Ligand binder design. Structure first.
Ligand code: HEM
Ligand code: HEM
Ligand code: HEM
Ligand code: HEM
Lengths: 141, 146, 141, 146
């Protein structure tokens, strides 16, 4: 459960990403593919090498998804319902993987926004990403 | 674990700039704030009521330097992490009863503190090498559980 | 998120526990201590041996926590608020453990209610016990 | 893994009463039903839409028989699990890329099946004995990840 402070924190931090939104998401993704190679198998249709137009494309998609959660932090199950269905029903993504990506996201954030990534805020972001992962995995059937 | 030479180079090279006196207390301080249940093992450390209290706690900073040392040791003995962490596995497994998942969490919180201090320098290929490192460390540290 | 179905299954399943609510609870504690020793360390003040009247008593406590959750399935965070604080704050229970007790409770119900424990019911309980667990681990700070 | 002779007696005693043609399909069935993301590895099995479909799918039953055969094997080689499952480890870790957390989950489901099938005869002691066993197997299967 997120607190008002977590909320204020995550909002605040995310805000400093600006036009870099899709660029970071693409990085986190790359980070993930490299550190955790098992996750590569969910994208046989993408070229995952550095600079891949696809990864760049998907990164932005991921970047927006999260902005949506940030904007709809108090109604996350609902805002993300559409994607929850995608990941579990159609994609069948192992729930284990939402933890690897949530990590590669924090990594990328600290590597680009050091003045924002304080311990209090790192706490907030972790709780956030976990809430998200909780929702995109809340629909297995 | 399997680091290619290139990886080894990237790892020690960045390690060589690591402030060994603070980095350790940073990672352990964050682990107690981000995953609050680990605070069950440090009731003797005193004031852990706010993030500020946790990071500025001497004992935390102090104990962290310890842990960080454990890693430096792994880094110097990449090919025998098992032998390297033999006595610490018995301490954390048979004596303290710390869930090996927590060793993975700690190793991850460090990969966070590393990217945070080295910024653009902690590239994805560099992070992939360090991920193999903390994986080898948690795995060996949990050897008395296997 | 529990579906109407899960709610119906859990309720119906639990209702076949009746007077055995406490006994089953105790038995689930015993299976945990015996299969997962590391757990014993949260009870240095309890004798954890067979027939232990302390275990028997805690069992009743837990079983009631669950019946409460069962009854307030639509308001679980609120129903167990008090218990979440205890486990996270004072007890500092490692979340990995709730998976463990949750597992033993299922194993207990499987051994006692062979006609109810169908694949589908089994799935409902697990989502239930996992929901319970998510609530008791939502208060770390 | 560490089984006392008393444990090895309770385990194999029970196992002797196990229907080797059915129990495996039951467990693999439940795994699919209870932990759905696991169907992603069974696309070729066809219908897995509902509990009944899953439980009635002959492909699930047969593949389960296979799975149960491997466990029976570990039971006869408790002191050398790593080797017994060497090839299966390469298959599930290097080739299929199954997160090892699912070997644990399939072990636990088996336990629930045994609890379901033996009722009172599956005492807390016999359960702790089998837990050790599944734990062993899940660990011997993940060796290529260690
Ligand atoms: C933070 C977590 C995640 C978010 C926000 C997210 C977001 C999205 C988005 C927005 C789409 C596009 C949906 C379409 O075009 O409607 C998508 C597609 C997809 N995602 Fe994710 N995703 C997440 C995690 C994962 C994970 C962990 C994996 C697997 C390792 C995965 C695999 C896929 C695949 C395979 C596609 C379809 C790719 C297409 O077939 O071309 N996702 N995701
Ligand atoms: C990668 C993981 C870790 C490393 C390398 C590590 C390293 C160490 C070191 C080098 C010592 C000092 C031993 C001395 O005095 O000889 C220590 C002590 C201790 N560690 Fe860790 N540790 C790890 C994880 C953890 C975790 C996760 C916890 C609890 C959450 C923990 C709890 C303890 C405690 C309570 C002591 C003090 C024991 C005593 O003095 O009696 N450790 N650890
Ligand atoms: C389904 C999950 C669980 C439920 C419903 C549950 C329920 C309860 C209940 C109702 C109490 C009594 C609260 C008092 O007297 O207000 C309690 C106490 C406690 N629980 Fe749990 N619990 C759960 C899981 C766990 C786990 C996984 C562990 C640790 C492995 C744990 C350790 C404890 C301890 C140590 C106490 C206090 C015992 C006293 O100090 O004497 N609980 N629990
Ligand atoms: C304790 C755990 C498990 C045991 C002992 C086990 C045992 C086996 C056996 C004996 C085979 C047949 C190999 C043959 O044809 O030579 C098999 C095949 C396979 N298993 Fe498992 N398994 C385990 C867990 C899992 C899990 C958790 C998954 C996925 C969720 C999985 C997916 C597969 C697949 C997809 C195949 C078919 C491979 C092929 O024919 O190419 N297994 N497994």
């Amino acid at each position: 459960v997120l607190s008002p402070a977590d909320k204020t924190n995550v909002k605040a931090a995310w805000g400093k990403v600006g036009a870099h939104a899709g660029e970071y998401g693409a990085e986190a993704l790359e980070r993930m593919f490299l550190s955790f190679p098992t996750t590569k198998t969910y994208f046989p249709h993408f070229d995952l090498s550095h600079g891949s137009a696809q990864v760049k494309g998907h990164g932005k998609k991921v970047a927006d998804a999260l902005t949506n959660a940030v904007a709809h932090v108090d109604d996350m199950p609902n805002a993300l319902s559409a994607l929850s269905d995608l990941h579990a029903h159609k994609l069948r993504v192992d729930p284990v993987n939402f933890k690897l990506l949530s990590h590669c996201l924090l990594v990328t954030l600290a590597a680009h926004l050091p003045a924002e990534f304080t311990p209090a805020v790192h706490a907030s972001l972790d709780k956030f990403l976990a809430s998200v992962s909780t929702v995109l995995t809340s629909k297995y059937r | 674990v399997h680091l290619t030479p290139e990886e080894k180079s990237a790892v020690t090279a960045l390690w060589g700039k690591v402030n060994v006196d603070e980095v350790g207390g940073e990672a352990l301080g964050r682990l107690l704030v981000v995953y609050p249940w680990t605070q069950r093992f440090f009731e003797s450390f005193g004031d852990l009521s706010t993030p500020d209290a946790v990071m500025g706690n001497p004992k935390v900073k102090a104990h962290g330097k310890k842990v960080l040392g454990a890693f430096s040791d792994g880094l110097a003995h990449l090919d025998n992490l098992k032998g390297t962490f033999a006595t610490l596995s018995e301490l954390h497994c048979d004596k303290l009863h710390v869930d090996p998942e927590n060793f993975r969490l700690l190793g991850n919180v460090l990969v966070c503190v590393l990217a945070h201090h080295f910024g653009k320098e902690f590239t994805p290929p560099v992070q992939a090498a360090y991920q193999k490192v903390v994986a080898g460390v948690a795995n060996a540290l949990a050897h008395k559980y296997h």
